[PDB]
Design an enzyme around this catalytic site. Structure first.
Site, PDB file in Angstrom:
ATOM      1  N   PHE A  76      -5.743   5.504   0.252  1.00 41.25           N
ATOM      2  CA  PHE A  76      -4.841   4.368   0.061  1.00 41.25           C
ATOM      3  C   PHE A  76      -4.891   3.830  -1.363  1.00 41.25           C
ATOM      4  O   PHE A  76      -5.963   3.746  -1.960  1.00 41.25           O
ATOM      5  CB  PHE A  76      -5.203   3.232   0.996  1.00 41.25           C
ATOM      6  CG  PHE A  76      -4.903   3.521   2.436  1.00 41.25           C
ATOM      7  CD1 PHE A  76      -3.647   3.311   2.966  1.00 41.25           C
ATOM      8  CD2 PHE A  76      -5.901   3.968   3.282  1.00 41.25           C
ATOM      9  CE1 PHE A  76      -3.377   3.544   4.311  1.00 41.25           C
ATOM     10  CE2 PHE A  76      -5.647   4.198   4.619  1.00 41.25           C
ATOM     11  CZ  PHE A  76      -4.427   3.997   5.135  1.00 41.25           C
TER      12      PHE A  76
ATOM     13  N   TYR B 279      -8.867   7.117  11.858  1.00 37.70           N
ATOM     14  CA  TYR B 279      -8.309   7.531  13.159  1.00 37.70           C
ATOM     15  C   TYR B 279      -9.126   8.642  13.845  1.00 37.70           C
ATOM     16  O   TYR B 279      -8.707   9.193  14.897  1.00 37.70           O
ATOM     17  CB  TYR B 279      -6.821   7.944  13.046  1.00 37.70           C
ATOM     18  CG  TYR B 279      -5.949   6.735  12.745  1.00 37.70           C
ATOM     19  CD1 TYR B 279      -5.478   5.932  13.765  1.00 37.70           C
ATOM     20  CD2 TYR B 279      -5.726   6.342  11.435  1.00 37.70           C
ATOM     21  CE1 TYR B 279      -4.724   4.796  13.494  1.00 37.70           C
ATOM     22  CE2 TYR B 279      -4.995   5.190  11.161  1.00 37.70           C
ATOM     23  CZ  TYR B 279      -4.531   4.426  12.200  1.00 37.70           C
ATOM     24  OH  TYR B 279      -3.821   3.259  11.896  1.00 37.70           O
TER      25      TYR B 279
ATOM     26  N   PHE C 218       1.982   9.590   3.791  1.00 36.11           N
ATOM     27  CA  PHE C 218       2.276   9.382   5.205  1.00 36.11           C
ATOM     28  C   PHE C 218       2.959   8.018   5.467  1.00 36.11           C
ATOM     29  O   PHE C 218       3.599   7.852   6.497  1.00 36.11           O
ATOM     30  CB  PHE C 218       1.055   9.559   6.123  1.00 36.11           C
ATOM     31  CG  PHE C 218      -0.112   8.658   5.806  1.00 36.11           C
ATOM     32  CD1 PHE C 218      -0.195   7.382   6.345  1.00 36.11           C
ATOM     33  CD2 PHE C 218      -1.154   9.104   5.010  1.00 36.11           C
ATOM     34  CE1 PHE C 218      -1.268   6.590   6.079  1.00 36.11           C
ATOM     35  CE2 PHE C 218      -2.226   8.284   4.713  1.00 36.11           C
ATOM     36  CZ  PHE C 218      -2.279   7.020   5.258  1.00 36.11           C
ATOM     37  N   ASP C 219       2.748   7.035   4.595  1.00 34.86           N
ATOM     38  CA  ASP C 219       3.349   5.708   4.780  1.00 34.86           C
ATOM     39  C   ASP C 219       3.208   4.877   3.524  1.00 34.86           C
ATOM     40  O   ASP C 219       2.307   5.088   2.741  1.00 34.86           O
ATOM     41  CB  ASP C 219       2.674   4.956   5.911  1.00 34.86           C
ATOM     42  CG  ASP C 219       3.503   3.826   6.466  1.00 34.86           C
ATOM     43  OD1 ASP C 219       4.749   3.959   6.447  1.00 34.86           O
ATOM     44  OD2 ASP C 219       2.891   2.906   7.036  1.00 34.86           O
TER      45      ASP C 219
ATOM     46  N   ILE D 109      -7.366  -0.436  10.843  1.00 32.96           N
ATOM     47  CA  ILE D 109      -8.529   0.442  10.830  1.00 32.96           C
ATOM     48  C   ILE D 109      -9.722  -0.178  10.132  1.00 32.96           C
ATOM     49  O   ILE D 109      -9.624  -1.041   9.271  1.00 32.96           O
ATOM     50  CB  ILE D 109      -8.193   1.813  10.167  1.00 32.96           C
ATOM     51  CG1 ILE D 109      -7.739   1.635   8.694  1.00 32.96           C
ATOM     52  CG2 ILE D 109      -7.215   2.558  11.033  1.00 32.96           C
ATOM     53  CD1 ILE D 109      -7.566   2.929   7.938  1.00 32.96           C
TER      54      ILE D 109
ATOM     55  N   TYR E 178       0.805  -1.214   0.000  1.00 31.78           N
ATOM     56  CA  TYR E 178       0.000   0.000   0.000  1.00 31.78           C
ATOM     57  C   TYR E 178       0.837   1.262   0.000  1.00 31.78           C
ATOM     58  O   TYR E 178       2.014   1.269   0.421  1.00 31.78           O
ATOM     59  CB  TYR E 178      -0.913   0.038   1.224  1.00 31.78           C
ATOM     60  CG  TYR E 178      -0.194   0.215   2.525  1.00 31.78           C
ATOM     61  CD1 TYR E 178      -0.050   1.459   3.087  1.00 31.78           C
ATOM     62  CD2 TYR E 178       0.405  -0.842   3.182  1.00 31.78           C
ATOM     63  CE1 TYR E 178       0.644   1.647   4.277  1.00 31.78           C
ATOM     64  CE2 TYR E 178       1.068  -0.678   4.383  1.00 31.78           C
ATOM     65  CZ  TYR E 178       1.182   0.578   4.955  1.00 31.78           C
ATOM     66  OH  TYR E 178       1.869   0.708   6.114  1.00 31.78           O
TER      67      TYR E 178
HETATM   68  C1  LIG Z   1      -9.326  -1.644  15.556  1.00 30.57           C
HETATM   69  O1  LIG Z   1      -8.928  -0.291  15.269  1.00 30.57           O
HETATM   70  C2  LIG Z   1      -7.645  -0.013  14.883  1.00 30.57           C
HETATM   71  C3  LIG Z   1      -6.686  -0.999  14.758  1.00 30.57           C
HETATM   72  C4  LIG Z   1      -5.407  -0.646  14.362  1.00 30.57           C
HETATM   73  C5  LIG Z   1      -5.064   0.673  14.136  1.00 30.57           C
HETATM   74  O2  LIG Z   1      -3.822   1.160  13.795  1.00 30.57           O
HETATM   75  C6  LIG Z   1      -2.645   0.313  13.697  1.00 30.57           C
HETATM   76  C7  LIG Z   1      -2.669  -0.521  12.421  1.00 30.57           C
HETATM   77  N1  LIG Z   1      -2.395   0.288  11.220  1.00 30.57           N
HETATM   78  C8  LIG Z   1      -0.982   0.717  11.002  1.00 30.57           C
HETATM   79  C9  LIG Z   1      -0.369   0.101   9.724  1.00 30.57           C
HETATM   80  C10 LIG Z   1       1.195   0.152   9.764  1.00 30.57           C
HETATM   81  O3  LIG Z   1       1.649  -0.876  10.622  1.00 30.57           O
HETATM   82  C11 LIG Z   1       1.715   1.507  10.175  1.00 30.57           C
HETATM   83  O4  LIG Z   1       3.056   1.709   9.532  1.00 30.57           O
HETATM   84  C12 LIG Z   1      -0.867   0.884   8.508  1.00 30.57           C
HETATM   85  C13 LIG Z   1      -1.349  -0.068   7.375  1.00 30.57           C
HETATM   86  C14 LIG Z   1      -2.682  -0.725   7.697  1.00 30.57           C
HETATM   87  C15 LIG Z   1      -3.742   0.389   7.958  1.00 30.57           C
HETATM   88  C16 LIG Z   1      -3.281   1.272   9.137  1.00 30.57           C
HETATM   89  C17 LIG Z   1      -3.422   0.520  10.334  1.00 30.57           C
HETATM   90  O5  LIG Z   1      -4.571   0.126  10.626  1.00 30.57           O
HETATM   91  N2  LIG Z   1      -1.931   1.869   8.903  1.00 30.57           N
HETATM   92  S1  LIG Z   1      -1.804   3.325   8.214  1.00 30.57           S
HETATM   93  O6  LIG Z   1      -1.098   3.302   6.910  1.00 30.57           O
HETATM   94  O7  LIG Z   1      -3.188   3.948   8.301  1.00 30.57           O
HETATM   95  C18 LIG Z   1      -0.776   4.216   9.343  1.00 30.57           C
HETATM   96  C19 LIG Z   1       0.503   4.590   8.978  1.00 30.57           C
HETATM   97  C20 LIG Z   1       1.290   5.271   9.887  1.00 30.57           C
HETATM   98 CL1  LIG Z   1       2.873   5.732   9.422  1.00 30.57          CL
HETATM   99  C21 LIG Z   1       0.832   5.605  11.141  1.00 30.57           C
HETATM  100  C22 LIG Z   1      -0.429   5.205  11.466  1.00 30.57           C
HETATM  101 CL2  LIG Z   1      -1.042   5.572  13.004  1.00 30.57          CL
HETATM  102  C23 LIG Z   1      -1.233   4.554  10.587  1.00 30.57           C
HETATM  103  C24 LIG Z   1      -6.040   1.636  14.263  1.00 30.57           C
HETATM  104  C25 LIG Z   1      -7.309   1.298  14.675  1.00 30.57           C
HETATM  105  O8  LIG Z   1      -8.339   2.192  14.888  1.00 30.57           O
HETATM  106  C26 LIG Z   1      -8.041   3.592  14.698  1.00 30.57           C
END
Ligand SMILES: COc1ccc(OCCN2C[C@H]([C@H](O)CO)[C@H]3CCC[C@@H](C2=O)N3S(=O)(=O)c2cc(Cl)cc(Cl)c2)cc1OC
Length: 121
Positions: A112, A95, A49-50, A69, A39
């Site tokens: 995404f 978030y 952001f990532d 998420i 992704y």
């Molecule tokens: C049940 O609810 C959640 C469960 C997990 C949550 O966040 C951590 C998991 N996460 C982080 C991953 C990566 O491990 C971060 O590098 C990433 C990919 C999967 C979706 C989402 C993501 O859901 N994120 S992200 O790309 O939205 C993200 C990147 C970064 Cl750099 C920081 C953050 Cl906080 C999120 C967030 C949640 O609710 C807000």
């Protein structure tokens, strides 16, 4: 349908999906499968952001287990192997009002591009 297909069960336009490349896969991943994706995530200002591509290895998670998420548990469940899609994820499915500083601001819609690489039961 201007910004994509509403794939939410509520039809609240909170997760909108656009297919960029159709998968040759036949089935979607099932709840509990180990799924492998690439992704890239961007904010509404266009800032990346990532990205898993930046780590040169896939992101791996168990589908439908709240490891990610809400927009992802919803969106990835609609994908077939080989598919690339764009997901617009409103804050209620990401978030929320808090965000997740430093990388995710308050009230942030996330954008995404997701490639479903593989999944295993
Ligand atoms: C049940 O609810 C959640 C469960 C997990 C949550 O966040 C951590 C998991 N996460 C982080 C991953 C990566 O491990 C971060 O590098 C990433 C990919 C999967 C979706 C989402 C993501 O859901 N994120 S992200 O790309 O939205 C993200 C990147 C970064 Cl750099 C920081 C953050 Cl906080 C999120 C967030 C949640 O609710 C807000």
């Amino acid at each position: 349908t201007e910004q994509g297909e509403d794939i939410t069960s509520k039809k609240d336009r909170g997760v909108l999906k656009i297919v960029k490349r159709v998968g040759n896969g036949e089935e979607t991943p099932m709840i509990g499968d180990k799924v492998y994706v690439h992704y890239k995530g961007k904010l509404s200002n266009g800032k990346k952001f990532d990205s898993s591509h930046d780590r040169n290895e896939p992101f791996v998670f168990s589908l439908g287990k709240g490891q990610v998420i809400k927009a992802w548990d919803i969106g990835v469940a609609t994908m077939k192997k080989g598919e690339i899609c764009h997901l617009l994820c409103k804050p209620e499915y990401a978030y929320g009002s808090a965000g997740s500083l430093p990388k995710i601001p308050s009230n942030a819609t996330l954008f995404f591009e997701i490639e479903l690489l593989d999944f295993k039961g």
